[PDB]
Write a sequence for this structure.
């Protein structure tokens, strides 16, 4: 549903820029009667003084002598910005909610849930990447081990990955400052071969 | 900018005979002499050629102005123009030297304008303001007019005849609704 709200609200603004008549105003010619068109000698005159003198950036404010019968009624365009703007941004985040990405990574505007991207990238590789890749690599581990005789295990390393470095350095600071246990006893905690 | 006319219309070009056929003919009594009727048509031509900025009998004008508006322009006010006669360019005292080149009359009912060739228009001396004599109007006779404009003269000159002072009495195509398409529609009240 949120894909269809996000597609159509971006197609709302796409269409609205392509089929919408705003006028900057209207010159109303009622006439002596209740209705009256103006002659083609008058209409070519009225375009020429509207084109040359009253349109453009170079003509902003010409005081526009309205004769008897003529009138300039300026139109507005009252909903200008933000046609389905917050329903699109909420739809743009409930797409990111389902796939599991946090909104900081792809660039969704909104509130700051995560702070400084080192915890937003670490939340990405722990909530929706490493749970996803450990289920694919475990299915590669069983299916490929039907071809060679020995059963193989094949799991992601969750080390030398750059997003879990804030997970890793506080581990190296935790047992590294634990000075009571010996040097061969803390190499085995970090996954180092003791020498 | 004065724009006085050279010669008035003679009255033998005005339809004082066709006005009484509008006035009392077909329905009525077969009243006043020609000098009373002719005082009401030219009082109704001059009311419509002032509201619509036209000329209707094609007499000759003289537009004497002191500064051009642009250098490729100076629209002429009386609308249906033909055959600008001369562009006299007097000095102070005025030995009265005409010019004969540089401009083109552009006959146009919208903006009858004088539009010099290129980008430069004949300049004006100090004190010697330039005069234009032109012959603006529809035709020399009355049968050359647009008939709706000629009818609104008769609808108005029969109003000035059949009721004398400013008394009491709008129909679909009245006097106002017929001359509303010969009036000048301009929406520039600005600097240029």
């Amino acid at each position: 549903v949120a894909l269809d709200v996000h597609n159509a609200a971006s197609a709302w603004s796409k269409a609205l820029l392509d089929n919408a008549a705003r006028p900057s105003g209207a010159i109303i010619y009622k006439g002596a009667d209740g209705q009256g068109v103006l002659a083609p000698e008058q209409y070519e005159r009225l375009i020429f003084e509207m084109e040359t003198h009253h349109q453009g950036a170079r003509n902003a404010g010409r005081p526009m002598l309205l004769e008897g019968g003529l009138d300039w009624k300026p139109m507005g365009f009252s909903p200008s910005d933000m046609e389905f703007h917050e329903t699109k941004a909420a739809a743009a985040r409930e797409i990111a909610l389902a796939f599991g990405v946090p909104p900081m990574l792809i660039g969704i505007p909104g509130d700051a849930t995560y702070a400084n991207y080192a915890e937003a990238n670490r939340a990405f590789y722990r909530l929706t990447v490493l749970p996803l890749l450990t289920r694919v690599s475990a299915a590669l581990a069983w299916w490929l081990s039907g071809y060679l005789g020995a059963q193989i295990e094949l799991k992601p390393d969750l080390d030398q990955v750059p997003a879990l470095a804030v997970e890793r350095d506080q581990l190296w600071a935790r047992i590294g400052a634990a000075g009571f246990l010996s040097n061969s006893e803390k190499r085995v905690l970090l996954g180092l071969p003791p020498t | 900018m004065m724009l006085n006319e050279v010669t008035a219309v003679p009255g033998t070009a005005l339809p004082v005979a066709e006005f009484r056929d509008h006035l009392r003919l077909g329905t009525g009594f077969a009243g006043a002499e020609d000098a009373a009727l002719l005082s009401y048509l030219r009082a109704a031509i001059a009311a419509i050629e002032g509201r619509t900025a036209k000329a209707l009998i094609s007499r000759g004008f003289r537009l004497a102005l002191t500064a051009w508006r642009w250098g490729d322009m100076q629209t002429l006010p009386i609308a249906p123009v033909a055959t600008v006669t001369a562009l006299r360019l007097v000095d102070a005292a005025g030995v009265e030297t005409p010019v004969a080149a540089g401009w083109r009359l552009v006959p146009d009912m919208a903006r009858p304008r004088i539009e010099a060739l290129g980008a430069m228009l004949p300049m004006i001396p100090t004190g010697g303001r330039v005069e234009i004599d032109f012959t603006a109007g529809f035709g020399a006779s009355w049968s050359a007019l647009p008939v709706d404009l000629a009818q609104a003269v008769f609808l108005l000159a029969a109003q000035y005849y059949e009721l004398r002072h400013d008394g009491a009495a709008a129909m679909p195509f009245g006097v106002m609704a017929l001359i509303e398409r010969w009036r000048t529609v301009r929406v520039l009240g600005g600097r240029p």
In short: The interface with chain B takes residues 27, 29, 31-33, 36, 38-39, 41-42, 44-46, 48-50, 52-54, 62-67, 69-70, 72 of chain A (CB under 8 Å).
